[PDB]
């Protein structure tokens, strides 16, 4: 149980944060990546939305049978692919999604396509305010209005909880990541210390259990790029990649975090029942650590 | 960290205990249980030698591999069919083992035959004395000189975590279990709280952490049984099974317990390869504690 009072924020009938056992594990499934074959050109956006559908209904079908409730993780390489992308998510889902790319150029041209819209304001998570934001993308992000964003800790200059922590609250010359966000109008905070490699997701976790214990706001992580550069596992095959890519990804939830990104949405199947296993435990203990399920739509009450 | 001293045991090399990220868990592999396709008749001890063989082989495989040491736990029907089986697994591996049986006066028989041999004292863990324990039980164990047992600090009328200090140290006019067990020459305890189902398996994790920090004697469980009953996951298939399955055993780990049955020998490959990633995790964060490793044999420093 945390220090801190936690901060539960409602994304569009999306629970996220509380203590461990409040509400269930939030999962965010990553579409169009690199190397997603149902992109047949990444440059220009475009895509089998058969195929994105088919995973967009099986993420929902998974979510009804667990509890789980689902963030989607859009990625994009290109301003025009990613705009049509985000289009096409709004239109096809309900659900809250996170604007991503590796290029703030990226993140900030989409933005500035898709305008003043209460649905994005509702429904588009700024994937990320990180180490590298500048005052244009702050600019960008106000200008859309954006409430809620990642803040991403992901830093090699920054390998220790504490280190991550301070570059979170802002140290000597530097504001912090946080006050960054609160500049763009950011008003709510997911919070992704980062993973640097599968061992350090334990550093991860230590992060997200800081972050919650003295500011309260959801902290989760996304180990998938982490799972599928460890050779050694990987090369075992089906069912050994995915048991040790299960240990990984449900490795924070046990240490109380509220969010996993757990990779290309395909893995969704065995994510969710992995996932769903680990908060049923947790949310059983909530008389021993005095917390109140905040829903009767949890594993808990679901997945037996 | 746990306040009291760990009692860390060497049974026949085999470390079990110490405080988080000190020791790798200790897995403890379930052969010639009731329906194992390996039996043919389970009163006789009927059972095929080179499959025996072959699960053993795995196991020292698996256990070179990762690091994570083993435990075989023997079951048995009748005092033939056990008699049986220990003499093979004395015969086919170093491991220690679990005398194990639904029936006490299986084990109280087996123990008869097997005799106060040295190789028993040192290799023979008496799984376990229970509330239900009789004289007739802690003689057989004094008459064959066994050294180490299973404690199943379990009570049906005793769920809080807390309450088994009362089951351990007495209450009342009850003798504790580590009372009954010593009054046996017992001088090394195994503490297994016990599991109800797969979501009380976060009860049974606080309970070992409860023992670990005011007795500080190894703890581990047992939730293999709750995982198999629970038919809506083990009719999915893989890797879904495995995931869930590895979600459940990996749990009690990351909580600080010590070791693991995690059912029939078959699951090893998947068990292993999960459990190794959650053991190599706990101790990257002995980077931050300055907890020392106890063994260079550590899933950390072998699976990457």
Chains 1, 2 share one sequence.
Not at 94 to 99: G, S
Request: charged fraction near 25%; proline fraction near 5%.
């Amino acid at each position: 149980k945390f220090t801190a009072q936690q901060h539960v924020y409602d994304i569009n009938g999306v629970k996220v944060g509380g203590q461990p056992g409040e509400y269930p594990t939030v999962l965010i499934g990553s579409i169009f990546y690199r190397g997603h074959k149902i992109v047949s050109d990444g440059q220009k956006g475009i895509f089998d939305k058969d195929a994105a559908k088919a995973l967009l209904d099986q993420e929902a079908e998974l979510s009804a049978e667990t509890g789980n409730p689902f963030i989607i993780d859009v990625l994009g390489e290109s301003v025009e692919a990613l705009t049509k992308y985000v289009e096409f998510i709004l239109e096809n889902t309900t659900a809250p999604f996170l604007l991503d790319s590796i290029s703030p150029d990226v993140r900030v041209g989409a933005l500035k396509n898709l305008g003043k819209d209460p649905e994005i304001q509702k429904r588009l998570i700024y994937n990320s305010i990180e180490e590298h934001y500048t005052e244009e993308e702050l600019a960008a992000i106000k200008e859309a209005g954006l409430k809620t964003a990642v803040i991403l800790a992901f830093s090699k200059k920054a390998l220790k909880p504490n280190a991550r922590i301070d570059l979170l609250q802002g140290k000597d010359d530097k504001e912090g990541l946080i006050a960054a966000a609160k500049r763009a109008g950011i008003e709510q905070f997911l919070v992704d210390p980062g993973v640097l490699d599968v061992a350090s997701n334990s550093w991860t976790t230590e992060a997200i259990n800081v972050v919650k214990e003295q500011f309260g706001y959801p902290g989760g992580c996304a180990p998938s790029n982490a799972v599928y550069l460890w050779k050694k596992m990987r090369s075992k095959g089906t069912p050994f990649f995915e048991v040790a890519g299960a240990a990984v990804f449900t490795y924070p939830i046990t240490q109380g975090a509220d969010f996993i990104l757990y990779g290309p949405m395909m893995n969704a199947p065995w994510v969710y029942r992995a996932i769903a296993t680990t908060d049923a435990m947790i949310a059983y203990n909530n008389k021993l650590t005095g917390v109140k399920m905040g829903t009767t739509e949890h594993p808990l009450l679901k997945i037996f």
